[PDB]
Amino acid sequence: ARRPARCYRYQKNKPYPKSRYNRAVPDSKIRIYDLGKKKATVDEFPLCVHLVSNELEQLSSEALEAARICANKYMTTVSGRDAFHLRVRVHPFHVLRINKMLSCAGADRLQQGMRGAWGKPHGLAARVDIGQIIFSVRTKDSNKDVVVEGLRRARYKFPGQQKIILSKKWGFTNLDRPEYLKKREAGEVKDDGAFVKFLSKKGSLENNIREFPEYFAA
Amino acid sequence: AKSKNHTAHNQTRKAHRNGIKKPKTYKYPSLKGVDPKFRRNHKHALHGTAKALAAAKK
Amino acid sequence: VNVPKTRKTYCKGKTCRKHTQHKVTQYKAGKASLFAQGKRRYDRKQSGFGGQTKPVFHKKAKTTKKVVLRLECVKCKTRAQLTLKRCKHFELGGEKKQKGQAL
Amino acid sequence: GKSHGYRSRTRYMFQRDFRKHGAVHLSTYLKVYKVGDIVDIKANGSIQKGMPHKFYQGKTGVVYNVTKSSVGVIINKMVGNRYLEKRLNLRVEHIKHSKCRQEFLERVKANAAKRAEAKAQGVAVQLKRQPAQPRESRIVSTEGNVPQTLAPVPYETFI
RNA sequence: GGUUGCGGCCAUAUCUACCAGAAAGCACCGUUUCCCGUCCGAUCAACUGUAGUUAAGCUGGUAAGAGCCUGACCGAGUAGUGUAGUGGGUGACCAUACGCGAAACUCAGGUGCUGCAAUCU
RNA sequence: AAACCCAUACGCGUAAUGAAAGUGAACGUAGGUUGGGGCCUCGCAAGAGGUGCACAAUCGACCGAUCCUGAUGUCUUCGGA
RNA sequence: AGCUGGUUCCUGCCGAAGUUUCCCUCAGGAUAGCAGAAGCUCGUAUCAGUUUUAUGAGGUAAAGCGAAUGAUUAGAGGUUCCGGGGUCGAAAUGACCUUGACCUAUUCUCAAACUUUAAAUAUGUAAGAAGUCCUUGUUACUUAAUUGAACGUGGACAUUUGAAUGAAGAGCUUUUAGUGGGCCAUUUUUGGUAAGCAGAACUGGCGAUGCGGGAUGAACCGAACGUAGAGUUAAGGUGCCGGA
RNA sequence: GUCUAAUUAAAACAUAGCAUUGCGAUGGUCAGAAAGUGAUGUUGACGCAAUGUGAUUUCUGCCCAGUGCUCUGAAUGUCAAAGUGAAGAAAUUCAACCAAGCGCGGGUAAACGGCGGGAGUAACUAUGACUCUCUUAAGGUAGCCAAAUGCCUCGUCAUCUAA
RNA sequence: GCUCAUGGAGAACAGAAAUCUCCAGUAGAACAAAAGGGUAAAAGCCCCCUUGAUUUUGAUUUUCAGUGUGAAUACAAACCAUGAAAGUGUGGCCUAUCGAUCCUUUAGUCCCUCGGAAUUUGAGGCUAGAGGUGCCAGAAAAGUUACCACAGGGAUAACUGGCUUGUGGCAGUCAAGCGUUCAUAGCGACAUUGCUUUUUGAUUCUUCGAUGUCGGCUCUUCCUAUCAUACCGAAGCAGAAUUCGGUAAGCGUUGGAUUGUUCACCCACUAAUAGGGAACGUGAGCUGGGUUUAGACCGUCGUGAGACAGGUUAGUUUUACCCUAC
RNA sequence: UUCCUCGUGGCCCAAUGGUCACGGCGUCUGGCUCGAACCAGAAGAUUCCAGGUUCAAGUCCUGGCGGGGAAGCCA
RNA sequence: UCCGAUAUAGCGUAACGGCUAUCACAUCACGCUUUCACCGUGGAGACCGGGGUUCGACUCCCCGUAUCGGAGCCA
């Protein structure tokens, strides 16, 4: 009863999100977006591998769920339940519509055709661009060949063309590896639960010394 | 039997066949809608001005 | 709605030509006169065979009527007319609205 | 059903501004408008009286009448295959002088000054403006400015 | 240059926390018979300018301050876009040609200017 | 059945405007301003000035209707400057 | 009979519409538009489907959410005289721990009916003689006031007279025909799985149009047509069919 | 027995039988432009006229609230013209009175026609004699049935057949 | 004149919410209603006074034909309110909240006419409103036709055909798992790529001066997505039987009970009883059981005439001698 | 699929927008006499769910769910 | 639109301008019977809304709402 994804693959309509004018939609079949050692710190997992899109299209929430499951199940069994942190980097917010017709013999008697053809919600999708990141998994350099395979397996669950890119940044950071290293050798960097805070040369000095004292103790 | 409801197709071609002329501008335009308190004085002022020029080059 | 029974407003009676106290009532049409030219004509036209010769209206759509006030000046007894918007309920005897009082 | 009212499709146009809500400064009311003055129309949404129709937003017209609180503006409006002249009675909050006429009259008096200055010696003022001409010959030195050779860069990911 | 009254532009003027304040002025301040208004002379009104105080208000300064303002060959001539092709591409879309051209981000700097009248070591 | 001739009327038009009773088109060189073909004067010409029909825009004046004001006067309620 | 069919010679010139508003209006009419004819007043302009300079207006694309509204993933650090649980507990404005909410600084992702900001393209005005300046006249308007407003007299400034390009004559009026079923292509876009589907926006075309090319085709490419000659080409092509 | 001559011969029509309705002649039903005019009627309730059902056998249950038909007429009901009274100078207006009809009140279903819904309940289960409740003018009775009438439906069981 | 929502901190009964006090608070509240704009010594909340929601007509903007109506704007000449005053006020903070002719009726001027002349009634006129047309530029209006008719329409349905392929059908990729162990012998979830046009829909391009609709019988050819037969490969293939797959459409694929049936279901034989196309092949080839004129019955609906992809029974199937093909 | 209607104590049913809701049956307690019937008395409710409108919602407005009903015709 | 009638305790109903008003039912008790019903005695309870006439309004006059019956109907 689920209509195939070729019917909702391409961005033909405007964004149609759940709001106070739609008000009646199904829930996403994907609900988990962070897997693995999501509580890990930034120094534990330097390497980042992205699965990015090379086509302007829509991705079904159930396709996202399937890819997430396949990747996690491969990488857990091979490397371990805590050797990676995987992040789904796109969220399904666009609601897809279906105008449901009668599939019975004798239907033209009732269907009314394309009259009142504005459809009803039956699914969700994520709109992705070219160069847009779909999945992002961070690991140690020892586990590159496992996450690359886990994402290469996930690719079969999506439509279109997806590339696997090794990022020059430190994990999920916007900084390159040597830049983050030369900022952590000094005390600009301060870990949080999962992500990290950086010292700025702006702001009050009392607070920037209350935090980051290792930078000033020169 | 439905039909075509509306289109502005061909209307610019039609208008520009003999079209978008500015209406025109004259000297001494209408005093229509102008304040009557101003019109009432302008009448008398013009009367006096005509009288004065007449008596001047009389 | 509610309108007062008295109203100070302009009178054109050739002696006041100014604001004056007016007594207010509600206008009522008046009984249709025989010997009016239209009724004479219509009765002549309905006399005999042919049946109903003029139209007769049925497609009533408005529930309300505009309410018209007759404003009688107490000095010269010149009465004026002024009409209101459409209102399902209308009242002259005014028990005013009071803010602080409780339900 | 359809809807074509007076203030239809005016949501963002008769919006006031960001951080400029409230009352209007007094220069709007202390400005002075004479007949023949050219004025642009920009409706203030906080003054609901004397407003223009949305058609006249961003329209420039000429004053034809002056009253207590309002100003009479003439506008030219395209109606089919012709222009019709339209008379608006607009409060001055929706009205400001056009700076184009001021910048033209400054040039007028400047040209008059130039003409009077150069008629004392007859040197062919040539007062007309001219477009930006092509640039003339010149010489470019390499003293301290030796050419820096460049090349296309290869492809990298940068993510 | 400071202060007051009346202002113009309306945060470069706001906000948070501290500091300082000659002179004059503003201010707090003192009183309730009268005009006047309140549950209350707290607000408002009137009287005194006398009994006192810069504590506050007000002004200014400070802050690797928040905000705001300005600029930049910072990002980025990027994104986007007008026009063109019997251009590529199964398509989705993407390049190229002649043009226009951002926002965020980054960095740097600044933190009220001014008009009329009066008055002040 | 043509052609020729003719009186008196009648029709349209020369006056409109008001439901009507009814009243009924010059302050002025039949107005002023702006522009206007053509003509005239000076000028070798260029051009300058005068006069400027028609036509156009505009401000005025006059007649009627409407709304006012309401003199001399008088069948004291008519008249309406 | 608002409906079907038919409507009789030639050549020449011009040459549409399928759109607006109203109608018991939707197979029709009136109305405006488009077209023709007759021309009138003038004679290079009181112009222009264009640019430039100056000046306005806008809220789409893009962008943003450690900026408001709304949606939304993940942890971190905190507060309960005050959410729900357990333990020491008699309880305590008493403590140790678990889970929720709330707060702070961060983090991932989004918006046709959210937005600080904000294009490109399109759009309004202006670029002088009906102008600018000086002097002083009218008024029952206006002013404290010969102070202003408007209209004026008189005087000064002419072809570089106030940017470019072009004008094929400019402006004006009367009357009347047909038409008021549209369709296709690029691009923008709505519904729809989609459609040689339905519906809008801009332009260009077919209709009303033959010609060369696309084997063949209403719309694509090229190019628009009096009759002929010579030459050169467009698009498309050059093994033969087929000119190369 | 009869019919759609020229696509339908039938279960349709008619029929005997059964039932109802109106009428005692200054009448019922019907006709006619009218009439000192007609049919029924050369008639007279074992008749005429108008309907319905359709031999025999066995039966023809409940409902008169609705629509109809009919029956009753003292009435603060309504109710036309004419006529009556007042006012008025008159046109005219305003009052009272006002036939039938309607309404008020009864009957009538072999007149038109109609004739329930939800819960619980019997110590295997199932069903529900029974109870409760709502409600109607009455709640489909005797009989009959997947019938020419039952959607679901090729209903379920048996018989008929190898199926 | 005052400032709201909300939060925080406090006060007997009093607690989550009664009343009071303070701090913060750019509006996170309220402004009749829908939404969007707008508004902070206000356009909000409270209080005081009021009727400008008044008169006279004109002009302008929107819809637009630059008509009407509606609504709104800014003025003029009056009269008023309010406030110390400036000023504001011609209904609702703005954007919606409504209506011709004719007729009737009211108000005003107490004005004009009733035409032989007068008075008084009555009537008709002038100016401004009301009684309403919601199909809202404004007829006075119930059904049925299966006994039907006419003008027309492929501007418009019921077939084929065409575009599309949601649905149907068929086939792939991936591989969590099943399979004693073992992902792929055989299967294969979560997902995803496609083909086809024997399904049904969507559409309305062609056909309404007619392309003879269901089914069956008969006959030919074609496709392959192969049921059997020939040859092979693989197996969770010992044999036998079976399953998967390939090349292959050369050859075959039945007889019957019930149903008008297509479809379906059973009996039986069989090597097998595979699927489909050819205008959903095939009516001047048949038949006419069904659908779908006219007769008639039933049930339900309807006051009724009559209606019913509800049931039942009865109901005219024309012409080739022409061209082509054979 | 469209339209209409209803949703209430264990069961059936009702309600003026105006008391945390009328009646009847059932249940419980006591009495009469062993049990029924009968006489007295009590208890029992988040008015189907999720939202809003008003000083106040069982009721007033929207969507979903479930129960029932009407329509689904020309070919 | 005209005529006529009606609105009264919780329901219904009656009335004279010399009463905030009788009645049967509903409920509050007291009574009477083995009990249940039947039955008797005292109570507490209401003149549709608003104006006017009157030594005195349920009552009469006017207006309005709701209901019923019959008559009428040119925007």
Ligand SMILES: [Mg+2]
């Ligand atoms: Mg069809």
Ligand SMILES: [Mg+2]
């Ligand atoms: Mg059309």
Ligand SMILES: [Mg+2]
């Ligand atoms: Mg008669």
Ligand SMILES: [Mg+2]
């Ligand atoms: Mg704006």
Ligand SMILES: [Mg+2]
């Ligand atoms: Mg003139």
Ligand SMILES: [Mg+2]
């Ligand atoms: Mg009409």
Ligand SMILES: [Mg+2]
């Ligand atoms: Mg036709």
Ligand SMILES: [Mg+2]
């Ligand atoms: Mg917009």
Ligand SMILES: [Mg+2]
């Ligand atoms: Mg966007």
Ligand SMILES: [Mg+2]
């Ligand atoms: Mg942005």
Ligand SMILES: [Mg+2]
């Ligand atoms: Mg946000």
Ligand SMILES: [Mg+2]
């Ligand atoms: Mg511009």
Ligand SMILES: [Mg+2]
């Ligand atoms: Mg025409």
Ligand SMILES: [Mg+2]
């Ligand atoms: Mg026409």
Ligand SMILES: [Mg+2]
């Ligand atoms: Mg044509």
Ligand SMILES: [Mg+2]
């Ligand atoms: Mg062509």
